[PDB]
């Protein structure tokens, strides 16, 4: 690791932009009341690459597919990560009961 967490360091412990923990919180909302997960991929399809889609194409399930989308973007960067975590809420507002302002 690194001795001096404060300035700029990649991966604090088990990730940075996106972790497996957050990936579960997302599916947890769909596992209860499913509906659709296309708009989430249709928007990420651009940020992702043709070769990357192959890794996700292997997954037939929809729920599991979302888990892969986070694994790729989670390592890509923050510019795409913020879009993914936000897209899930921006595309599926029903999942939340009011983003609230403060």
From Swiss-Prot:
Q: Report the superkingdom from the record.
A: Eukaryota
Q: What is this protein called?
A: Tumor necrosis factor receptor superfamily member 21
Q: Which residues of the full protein are shown?
A: 567 to 655 of 655
Q: Which organism is it from?
A: Homo sapiens
| Protein induction | Up-regulated by TNF.
| Its job | Promotes apoptosis, possibly via a pathway that involves the activation of NF-kappa-B. Can also promote apoptosis mediated by BAX and by the release of cytochrome c from the mitochondria into the cytoplasm. Trophic-factor deprivation triggers the cleavage of surface APP by beta-secretase to release sAPP-beta which is further cleaved to release an N-terminal fragment of APP (N-APP). Negatively regulates oligodendrocyte survival, maturation and myelination.
List localization entries: Cell membrane
- How is the subunit organization of this protein annotated in UniProt? Associates with TRADD. Interacts with NGFR. Interacts with CASP8. (Microbial infection) Interacts with hepatitis C virus (HCV) non-structural protein 5A; this interaction allows the modulation by the virus of JNK, p38 MAPK, STAT3, and Akt signaling pathways in a DR6-dependent manner.
Tissue distribution is: Detected in fetal spinal cord and in brain neurons, with higher levels in brain from Alzheimer disease patients (at protein level). Highly expressed in heart, brain, placenta, pancreas, lymph node, thymus and prostate. Detected at lower levels in lung, skeletal muscle, kidney, testis, uterus, small intestine, colon, spleen, bone marrow and fetal liver. Very low levels were found in adult liver and peripheral blood leukocytes.
Q: How is it modified after translation?
A: Oxidized in response to reactive oxygen species (ROS), leading to endocytosis.
């Amino acid at each position: 690791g690194s001795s001096g967490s404060s300035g700029s360091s990649a991966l604090s412990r088990n990730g940075s932009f996106i972790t497996k923990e957050k990936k579960d919180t997302v599916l947890r909302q769909v596992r209860l009341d499913p509906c659709d997960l296309q708009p989430i991929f249709d928007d990420m399809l651009h940020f992702l690459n043709p070769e990357e889609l192959r890794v996700i194409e292997e997954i037939p399930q929809a729920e599991d597919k979302l888990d892969r989308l986070f694994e790729i973007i989670g390592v890509k960067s923050q510019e795409a990560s913020q879009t993914l975590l936000d897209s899930v809420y921006s595309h599926l507002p029903d999942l939340l009961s009011g983003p609230s302002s403060g």
